[PDB]
Every structure is written in structure tokens, then in C-alpha cells.
Amino acid sequence: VSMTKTSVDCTMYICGDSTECSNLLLQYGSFCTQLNRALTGIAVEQDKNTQEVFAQVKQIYKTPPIKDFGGFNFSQILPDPSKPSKRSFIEDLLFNKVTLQKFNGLTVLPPLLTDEMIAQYTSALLAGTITSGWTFGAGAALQIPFAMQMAYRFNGIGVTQNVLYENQKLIANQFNSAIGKIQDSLSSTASALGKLQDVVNQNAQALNTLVKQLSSNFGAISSVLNDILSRLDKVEAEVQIDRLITGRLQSLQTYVTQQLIRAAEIRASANLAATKMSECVLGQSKRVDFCGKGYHLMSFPQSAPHGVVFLHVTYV
Amino acid sequence: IANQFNSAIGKIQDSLSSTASALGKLQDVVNQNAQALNTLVKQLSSNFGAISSVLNDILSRLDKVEAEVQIDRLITGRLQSLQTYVTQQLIRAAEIRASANLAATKMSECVLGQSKRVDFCGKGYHLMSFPQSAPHGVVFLHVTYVPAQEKNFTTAPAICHDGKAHFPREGVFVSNGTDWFVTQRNFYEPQIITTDNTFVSGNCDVVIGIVNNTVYDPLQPELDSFKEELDKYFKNHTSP
Amino acid sequence: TDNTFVSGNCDVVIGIVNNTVYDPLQPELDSFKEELDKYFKNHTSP
Amino acid sequence: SQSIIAYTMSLGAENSVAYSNNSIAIPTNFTISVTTEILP
Numbered sequence: 001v002s003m004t005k006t007s008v009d010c011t012m013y014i015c016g017d018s019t020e021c022s023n024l025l026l027q028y029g030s031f032c033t034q035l036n037r038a039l040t041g042i043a044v045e046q047d048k049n050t051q052e053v054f055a056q057v058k059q060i061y062k063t064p065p066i067k068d069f070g071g072f073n074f075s076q077i078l079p080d081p082s083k084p085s086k087r088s089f090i091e092d093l094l095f096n097k098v099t100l101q102k103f104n105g106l107t108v109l110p111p112l113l114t115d116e117m118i119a120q121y122t123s124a125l126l127a128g129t130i131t132s133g134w135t136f137g138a139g140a141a142l143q144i145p146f147a148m149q150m151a152y153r154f155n156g157i158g159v160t161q162n163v164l165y166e167n168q169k170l171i172a173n174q175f176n177s178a179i180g181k182i183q184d185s186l187s188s189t190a191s192a193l194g195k196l197q198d199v200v201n202q203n204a205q206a207l208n209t210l211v212k213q214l215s216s217n218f219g220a221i222s223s224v225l226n227d228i229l230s231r232l233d234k235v236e237a238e239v240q241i242d243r244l245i246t247g248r249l250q251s252l253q254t255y256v257t258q259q260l261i262r263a264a265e266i267r268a269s270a271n272l273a274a275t276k277m278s279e280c281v282l283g284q285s286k287r288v289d290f291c292g293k294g295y296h297l298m299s300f301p302q303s304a305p306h307g308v309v310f311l312h313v314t315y316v
Numbered sequence: 317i318a319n320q321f322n323s324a325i326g327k328i329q330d331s332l333s334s335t336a337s338a339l340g341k342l343q344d345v346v347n348q349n350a351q352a353l354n355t356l357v358k359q360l361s362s363n364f365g366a367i368s369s370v371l372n373d374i375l376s377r378l379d380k381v382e383a384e385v386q387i388d389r390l391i392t393g394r395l396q397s398l399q400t401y402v403t404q405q406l407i408r409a410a411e412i413r414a415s416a417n418l419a420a421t422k423m424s425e426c427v428l429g430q431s432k433r434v435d436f437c438g439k440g441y442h443l444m445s446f447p448q449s450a451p452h453g454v455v456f457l458h459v460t461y462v463p464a465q466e467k468n469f470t471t472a473p474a475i476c477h478d479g480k481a482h483f484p485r486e487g488v489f490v491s492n493g494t495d496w497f498v499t500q501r502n503f504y505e506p507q508i509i510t511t512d513n514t515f516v517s518g519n520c521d522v523v524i525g526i527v528n529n530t531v532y533d534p535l536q537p538e539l540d541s542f543k544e545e546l547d548k549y550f551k552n553h554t555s556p
Numbered sequence: 557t558d559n560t561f562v563s564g565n566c567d568v569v570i571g572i573v574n575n576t577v578y579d580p581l582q583p584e585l586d587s588f589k590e591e592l593d594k595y596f597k598n599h600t601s602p
Numbered sequence: 603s604q605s606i607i608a609y610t611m612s613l614g615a616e617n618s619v620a621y622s623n624n625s626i627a628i629p630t631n632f633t634i635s636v637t638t639e640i641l642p
């Protein structure tokens with residue numbers, strides 16, 4: 001749904017504790033401001049993306065104090081109030097199964113929405129989902145009993161609604177056991193989170209690569225700036241310095257171009273995730289292979305670090 | 317419906333007539349094309365290390381063999397400027413196409429058709445939409461049914477009438493708390509629970525939360541009318 | 557005749573098969589006819 | 603008498619859905635809504 005936000009001081013990356021390096025950087029004009037702008041145009045897009053994926057309701061719906069959902073035991077995915085975090089149990093796995101510089105002018109400022117706020121939006125999306133059916137996605141949240149919501153779902157997949165009621169104990173049991181297979185699978189392997197652990201590793205390795213380039217000679221006799229300004233004269237050290245300005249500026253331009261290209265793929269991912277939120281959570285999609293595999297009944301959104309995770313519920 | 321629709325077309329017209337900044341999504345395109353062109357012009361002032369940035373002032377101060385050292389400079393930094401711009405523009409071109417593919421998809425599924433996708437054609441149940449030109453953009457006026465005055469009712473998933481379990485064909489069973497009715501899934505318009513509004517399957521032991529009420533048959537008064545007609549003609553035919 | 561519906565003759569639909577189709581009017585018209593029939597037999601006695 | 607205020611962001615209007623195993627909220631009137639959407 002997002003990458004990390006980032007800002008770099010182009011001056012503290014290229015230079016640092018050297019005024020004559022800045023007096024050389026200014027000889028290249030506006031590039032540094034354009035770079036900072038460019039990363040700001042990514043960073044703004046990260047909070048926009050997160051807000052379009054999760055903020056699809058203008059009301060928080062609290063889940064009701066009594067859990068009479070006809071036998072569907074949502075307690076694995078509803079928030080637990082008894083804990084310090086207001087995350088669900090399943091999403092408190094997701095928050096751990098993904099795992100995770102200021103000296104060089106790089107700054108990794110926080111998102112707009114906090115994780116405890118995203119947890120509240122995914123709570124309201126789920127709580128509306130089990131108490132209201134889909135109606136809150138179009139108008140007001142209108143209550144209906146969950147076994148009648150599922151009857152409507154069944155009608156949606158073209159299966160006549162007696163088929164729910166004649167089998168309700170079985171259908172809830174199958175469902176409840178299936179929410180168990182999710183829980184245990186997420187407890188078993190990292191290989192499920194790989195789409196997120198990838199985009200976290202890749203944005204980390206991008207910053208770590210931009211930092212190591214500070215040590216590159218680029219054909220100057222040393223990358224340590226104080227060597228160049230101490231050991232050599234003002235007019236030939238200027239020639240050794242323009243090598244470092246030029247190599248480091250190309251390095252930052254490589255990072256900024258790479259981040260824009262990435263942020264274009266994260267956007268596409270966020271616009272998909274926002275579309276799956278609207279059409280799979282706030283509704284029942286008729287589209288084959290869109291809300292998972294089978295015929296679609298409903299889905300439940302969860303938070304994950306920089307991402308959204310859908311439990312798609314389907315009839316097979 | 318028409319008065320509400322006309323009032324809503326009114327509201328959109330008055331909104332965009334009153335406010336300053338709703339088209340921000342289009343102005344930030346025209347702003348970025350202007351601001352990037354201007355930045356590409358600003359770079360014409362950059363020395364990039366050269367004694368001067370004005371190309372002709374180099375040629376009017378240095379000779380053919382030594383001026384080439386300054387000019388290579390200016391060629392380096394201006395070429396870096398253009399590759400910066402053309403990369404930045406190619407990236408935008410990918411965003412604007414992704415926006416235009418969404419706009420074609422909305423034209424196709426919201427103007428040329430009715431969509432069942434939730435909020436793909438604006439936040440409500442989609443009725444239809446009208447496209448409008450805007451500079452470098454499209455604007456969709458989406459027209460939507462939105463539920464308003466709610467009322468609570470008691471309900472049950474099925475009805476028992478003779479040990480057999482009944483279900484709505486279309487819609488849902490409702491009660492005001494005195495009498496039981498069936499009504500359509502999106503708008504309260506109750507009906508008497510007839511065997512033509514409903515279908516039957518299985519028996520009252522299995523359906524959790526089933527409730528008891530009479531299920532009416534429109535053949536019953538017809539047949540009853542035949543009875544009274546017949547019983548009269550048999551009472552009559554005692555006489556001769 | 558409440559789960560199905562009727563159109564055209566059986567010569568146009570390639571691969572059609574034969575079976576009886578039940579009509580729920582009929583046994584009610586019949587159970588009326590036997591009751592009405594009794595009304596006629598009893599009414600022969602006066 | 604104006605000044606800048608800084609606050610934790612409200613997620614929305616907080617609400618509780620009146621759920622019970624036998625209760626339903628069939629809507630009884632509607633408003634046709636026309637909403638603008640803008641794309642580049």
C-alpha cells in the first residue's frame with residue numbers, strides 16, 4: 001500500500017562541514033531542489049495511497065458487545081480490547097512476520113496515518129462488514145442478522161438461500177476451521193509475507209546503496225572530503241572536488257529515479273488494493289478470480305506493515 | 317425522483333460556481349508541466365563549472381582549442397538537465413496513462429453501461445453517469461440511488477405454516493412487531509406473505525430462528541367463491 | 557408449471573427429451589371434483 | 603482571535619451499529635445523489 005517516506009538533504013549528502021563544497025554545488029544550480037521536490041512528490045503519494053486504501057468509510061463502526069453472529073466466531077479477526085495495541089490477533093502476526101543513517105542527511109520521516117489509526121479503519125471496515133452487510137459502502141450502515149447477510153451472499157452466487165439455513169452449523173464450522181488454517185499458516189511460514197518483505201527489503205537496500213556510494217572515489221584521489229581540501233591547493237583541489245560533486249549527484253539522481261519508478265509500482269498496487277477494498281469488502285464481487293479463488297461471498301481487510309491483507313471468503 | 321435529480325444537478329453547478337479548488341487534480345498536471353519546463357529553462361543559467369553560462373559569451377572570450385574545455389562542460393550539464401526532464405516526463409506519462417485507462421474504463425462501465433461494482437461509479441448504488449470535457453481531463457457526473465430514511469423491523473430467515481419451511485423468492489420477511497410481511501431487499505414496500513411471493517423447502521426442525529405465521533394462497537378465495545356458488549345451486553335444486 | 561415455463565413445439569429444440577410435467581392446479585381441481593361429485597351423489601337422495 | 607491549532611486527527615464520526623440476531627433496518631425513502639468525479 002506504501003513505501004516509507006523519505007527526504008534527503010542533497011547538500012548534506014554531497015558535502016558536509018565544508019562551505020567550499022556548497023560553493024561548488026551551487027555552480028550546478030537548481031538540481032538539488034528538484035531532487036528534494038521529487039522525493040516530496042513520492043512522500044505525499046504515500047499518505048494519499050494509504051488514505052485511499054483504508055479511509056473508504058467516514059464513520060468508525062464499533063463491533064457490538066454481544067457476539068451472536070449465528071455461529072461465525074470472528075474473534076480471531078475482530079480487535080481485542082484487552083491488549084495495549086488495538087490490533088486483532090491475526091494482524092498481530094502480520095505485524096511481526098515482516099521485519100525491519102541520519103549521519104548522511106537521509107531522513108525517514110513517519111507516515112501520516114499511524115498503525116494504531118490504520119488498525120481503527122480496518123476495525124470499522126470489518127465491524128461494518130459483519131454487522132451491516134454491504135450497505136454502509138453505499139449509504140448508511142443498516143443492521144441485518146449475519147445469517148441473513150450470508151443468505152444474501154448465497155443468493156449472489158446464484159445458490160438458493162435455503163442451502164444456507166439447512167446447513168448453517170456446517171457452513172459456520174467450515175468457515176471457523178478455515179480461519180484456523182489462515183492463523184496456523186501465518187504462524188508456520190514467512191513465505192506468505194514475501195510481497196511485503198520484498199518492498200521493505202528493497203526500499204532499505206536502496207537507501208543503503210545510496211549511502212555506500214559516499215565512499216566511492218569517482219576518480220578523485222579519496223572520497224574523504226577533508227583529505228582533498230587539506231592535502232591539495234585551492235585551484236587543483238577544486239578539480240578533485242568537482243569529481244565528487246558530479247559522482248555523488250549522479251548517485252542521488254539514481255536513487256531518486258529508482259524511487260520514482262518504484263513508487264509508480266506501489267501506486268498501481270495501492271489502486272488495486274483500494275479497488276479490492278471497495279469491490280470485495282464493501283460488497284460482493286461477481287468477478288471471477290478477483291476476490292480470491294472460487295465464488296466470492298465476502299472479505300475481511302487486515303493491516304500489515306506498509307500493506308493491506310485480505311481474507312477472501314469463497315464458496316467452492 | 318426528477319425534482320431531487322434536478323436539485324442535485326443544481327447543487328453540482330452551484331458548487332463549482334461557488335468554490336475555488338475542486339479541480340485541483342487537473343490543475344496539478346498543468347502546474348507540473350509548467351513548473352518542470354520552467355526548471356529546464358532555469359538550468360540554462362547554471363555554470364556547471366564553466367567561467368560563464370552564456371554559450372556565446374564563451375565563444376566571444378576564448379579560442380577554438382581552449383573554449384572547447386568550457387563548452388564540454390555546458391554540454392555535460394545541459395544534457396544532464398534534458399535527461400532529468402525526459403525521465404521525469406516519461407514517469408508522468410506512465411501516471412497519466414494509468415489515469416486515462418481508468419477514465420476509459422469509467423466511460424465504458426459507467427457511461428456506456430450500468431455497473432454493479434461498489435463505488436466504481438461514485439459512492440452509492442450506480443444508476444448512470446454523464447461525461448463532461450475539462451481541459452486535459454474528463455469529469456464524470458455520477459447519478460446514484462442512496463438510501464435515506466431507515467426504520468427498524470424484526471425479521472426471521474424463514475416462516476412455518478404447516479411444518480414446512482418458507483423463504484422469500486425475492487426480498488425478506490419483516491414485521492412491525494404485530495404482523496408479518498415480505499418486502500424487497502432495498503426499499504420498504506411490504507406485502508402479504510403469499511405462496512406466490514415465497515417458495516418452500518424442508519421442515520421447521522432445521523432452520524435456526526424460524527417463526528410461525530399463516531402463508532396465504534390466492535387460489536383460496538377463488539375456490540371458496542366456487543363453493544358458495546355451488547352450495548347455493550345445491551340448496552336451490554332441493555326445491556322442484 | 558411453476559419451476560418451468562413453456563414456448564414452441566418439440567420439433568425445433570435439438571436434443572429435447574420426453575417426460576410428464578406436473579401441474580399443481582390439477583389435483584386440487586380433482587380433489588374438488590370428487591367432493592363436488594359426492595355433493596351430487598348425496599343430493600340424489602332427496 | 604484566530605490561531606493555529608494542532609490535534610490528533612479524528613478518523614471519522616464514531617458510531618455503533620444496532621445489531622441483534624433478529625433486527626433489520628430496511629430503508630423506506632431515498633435521495634438521488636449526483637456526485638462529481640475528476641480524472642486527468
Ligand SMILES: *[C@@H]1O[C@H](CO)[C@@H](O[C@@H]2O[C@H](CO)[C@@H](O[C@H]3O[C@H](CO)[C@@H](O)[C@H](O)[C@@H]3O)[C@H](O)[C@H]2NC(C)=O)[C@H](O)[C@H]1NC(C)=O
Pocket residue numbers: 492493494495
Ligand atoms: C403493522 O402493520 C399492519 C398493516 O398495516 C397493521 O394492521 C392493519 O391495521 C389496520 C388499521 O390501521 C386494519 O384496518 C382494518 O381493521 C378491520 C379488519 O377487519 C376493519 O374493522 C377496519 O375497517 C379496517 O378494514 C388492517 O386490517 C390491519 N392489517 C392487517 C394485516 O391485519 C398494524 O396495526 C401495524 N402495527 C403497528 C405496530 O404499526
Ligand SMILES: *[C@@H]1O[C@H](CO)[C@@H](O[C@@H]2O[C@H](CO)[C@@H](O[C@H]3O[C@H](CO)[C@@H](O)[C@H](O)[C@@H]3O)[C@H](O)[C@H]2NC(C)=O)[C@H](O)[C@H]1NC(C)=O
Pocket residue numbers: 476479528
Ligand atoms: C410454532 O407453531 C407450532 C404449532 O403450534 C409449535 O409446535 C408445537 O410445539 C409444542 C411444544 O414443543 C409441541 O407440544 C406437544 O409435544 C409433545 C408431542 O410432540 C406432547 O407430549 C406434548 O404434550 C405437547 O402436546 C407440539 O407437538 C408442536 N406441534 C407442531 C405441529 O409442531 C411451535 O412450538 C411454535 N413455536 C413458536 C415459537 O411459536
Ligand SMILES: *[C@@H]1O[C@H](CO)[C@@H](O[C@@H]2O[C@H](CO)[C@@H](O[C@H]3O[C@H](CO)[C@@H](O)[C@H](O)[C@@H]3O)[C@H](O)[C@H]2NC(C)=O)[C@H](O)[C@H]1NC(C)=O
Pocket residue numbers: 574
Ligand atoms: C417423444 O414423445 C412423442 C409424443 O408421443 C413421440 O412422438 C411420436 O412418435 C411416433 C413415431 O415417430 C409418431 O408416430 C407416427 O409416425 C408416422 C406419421 O408421422 C406414421 O408412420 C406412424 O404410423 C405414426 O402415425 C407419432 O405421430 C409422434 N407423435 C406426434 C405428436 O407426432 C416421440 O416419438 C417420443 N420420443 C422419444 C425418444 O420418446
Ligand SMILES: *[C@@H]1O[C@H](CO[C@@H]2O[C@@H](C)[C@@H](O)[C@@H](O)[C@@H]2O)[C@@H](O[C@@H]2O[C@H](CO)[C@@H](O)[C@H](O)[C@H]2NC(C)=O)[C@H](O)[C@H]1NC(C)=O
Pocket residue numbers: 466467468619620621627
Ligand atoms: C432501531 O432500534 C434501535 C434499538 O432498539 C430499539 O430500542 C428501544 C429504544 C425501542 O425503540 C425498541 O422498540 C427498539 O427495538 C435503535 O438504536 C438506539 O438508537 C438511540 C438513538 O435513537 C441510541 O441512543 C441507542 O444507544 C440505540 N440503542 C441500541 C441498543 O443500539 C435504532 O436507532 C433504531 N433505528 C431506527 C432507524 O429506527
Ligand SMILES: *[C@@H]1O[C@H](CO)[C@@H](O[C@@H]2O[C@H](CO)[C@@H](O)[C@H](O)[C@H]2NC(C)=O)[C@H](O)[C@H]1NC(C)=O
Pocket residue numbers: 067073075076
Ligand atoms: C472463538 O474461538 C476461539 C478459538 O479459536 C475461542 O478462544 C478459546 O476459548 C477457550 C475457552 O475460553 C480458551 O481455553 C482458549 O485458550 C481460547 N483460545 C484463544 C486463541 O483465545 C473463543 O472462546 C471462541 N468464542 C466463541 C464466542 O465461541
Ligand SMILES: *[C@@H]1O[C@H](CO)[C@@H](O[C@@H]2O[C@H](CO)[C@@H](O)[C@H](O)[C@H]2NC(C)=O)[C@H](O)[C@H]1NC(C)=O
Pocket residue numbers: 170173174
Ligand atoms: C459435506 O462435507 C462436510 C465436510 O467438508 C461433511 O461434514 C463432515 O461429516 C463427517 C460425517 O459424515 C464428520 O466426520 C465430519 O466431522 C464433518 N465435518 C464438518 C466440518 O462438519 C458433511 O457430512 C457433508 N455433507 C453432505 C450432505 O455430504
Ligand SMILES: *[C@@H]1O[C@H](CO)[C@@H](O[C@@H]2O[C@H](CO)[C@@H](O)[C@H](O)[C@H]2NC(C)=O)[C@H](O)[C@H]1NC(C)=O
Pocket residue numbers: 319320465630631632633
Ligand atoms: C422522501 O424524502 C423526500 C425529500 O428528500 C420527501 O419530499 C419532501 O416532502 C415534504 C412533505 O412531506 C415537503 O415539505 C418537501 O418539500 C418535499 N421535498 C421534495 C424534494 O419534494 C418525501 O416526502 C419523502 N417520502 C416519503 C415516503 O417519506
Ligand SMILES: *[C@@H]1O[C@H](CO)[C@@H](O)[C@H](O)[C@H]1NC(C)=O
Pocket residue numbers: 068524525526623
Ligand atoms: C437471539 O439472542 C437472544 C439473546 O440476546 C437469545 O435468547 C435467543 O435465543 C437468540 N435467538 C436466535 C434464533 O439466535
Ligand SMILES: *[C@@H]1O[C@H](CO)[C@@H](O)[C@H](O)[C@H]1NC(C)=O
Pocket residue numbers: 552553555
Ligand atoms: C334457482 O336457480 C335458478 C338458476 O339456476 C334461478 O333461475 C332460480 O330463480 C333460483 N331459485 C331459487 C328459489 O333459488
Ligand SMILES: *[C@@H]1O[C@H](CO)[C@@H](O)[C@H](O)[C@H]1NC(C)=O
Pocket residue numbers: 570571
Ligand atoms: C449424442 O451423441 C450420440 C453419439 O455418441 C448420438 O447418437 C446422439 O444423436 C447425440 N445426441 C444429440 C442430442 O446430439
Ligand SMILES: *[C@@H]1O[C@H](CO)[C@@H](O)[C@H](O)[C@H]1NC(C)=O
Pocket residue numbers: 594595598599602
Ligand atoms: C348430505 O346432504 C345433506 C343436505 O341435504 C347434508 O346435511 C349432509 O351433511 C350431507 N352428507 C354428506 C356425507 O355429504
